Ligand SMILES: O=P(O)(O)C(O)(Cc1cccnc1)P(=O)(O)O
């Protein structure tokens with residue numbers, strides 16, 4: 001039962017959930033990784049990790065991925081959530097120096113992860129392990145694209161740090177541009193490719209239908225997170241949220257901003273259904289009769305299939321995950337799973 005303010009009947013009726021068969025092993029293996037990389041305290045791992053549903057989120061998204069690819073993605077995605085938590089905590093505690101140093105180390109570790117596998121900062125060491133593993137699946141040109149994209153994500157996190165320190169709420173257009181980076185749209189899009197076992201040529205992944213289907217899938221995920229994470233984020237003095245920019249710059253009430261965010265999320269779905277037809281037509285066209293063609297066709301089709309799976313995985317994740325259950329916290333400003 002999804003709250004009426006958050007319910008999307010089109011997702012429930014037309015985007016049936018999928019789950020990767022490796023998910024049972026994935027859940028425990030990522031929990032063990034969080035424990036052994038010291039990315040969460042042992043008692044917080046035991047009490048909260050499974051309930052945060054991070055592995056479920058990936059296992060409902062990258063269908064068809066090799067077990068080892070899914071494992072590295074899930075470890076990275078759990079790392080990403082812990083990094084969001086650390087970033088938030090550095091902000092709340094005014095640890096500008098610790099954040100700046102961390103920011104620099106992630107930039108460096110991103111380009112040479114193997115050199116950082118045993119760094120003193122467990123968050124940097126965890127990052128490097130997952131990234132080194134992700135760099136092992138596809139050619140160096142894919143690794144360099146992942147790094148280029150994540151360098152941009154790190155700097156968007158830095159911009160968020162400056163905004164919240166200075167109490168600046170981005171304008172709507174400014175936020176929509178920033179949100180494609182803080183949510184890491186293009187990282188999740190990159191990671192479709194090791195999941196289907198094929199680095200896509202630029203001509204293929206920059207095709208207008210592939211690009212637009214990829215964009216809309218991520219816009220939905222980020223803006224649906226905004227809709228669902230708004231209570232926790234208002235309680236935690238987070239300023240980055242489409243609803244908050246609407247209240248601040250467009251003078252909407254809370255109920256009207258929630259309504260406008262809802263409508264924008266709903267439009268993402270029906271825009272995606274239109275372009276999905278074009279992206280799958282393009283997949284069919286790539287099967288020109290040659291071996292390379294059949295391979296590229298299959299990879300594009302699998303990737304567009306997972307762009308669709310992202311809709312249902314993110315939807316149900318926000319109603320299942322303990323990450324957003326702010327009403328159950330004694331201190332609504334400090335989630336119990338964060339290192340405070
Ligand atoms: O769970 P959260 O904090 O609402 C979030 O989605 C965490 C997150 C960050 C980046 C990518 N995916 C999830 P955020 O982006 O900070 O709003």
Ligand SMILES: [Mg+2]
Pocket residue numbers: 084088
């Ligand atoms: Mg956050």
Ligand SMILES: [Mg+2]
Pocket residue numbers: 084182
């Ligand atoms: Mg964030």
Ligand SMILES: [Mg+2]
Pocket residue numbers: 225226229230233
């Ligand atoms: Mg959020």
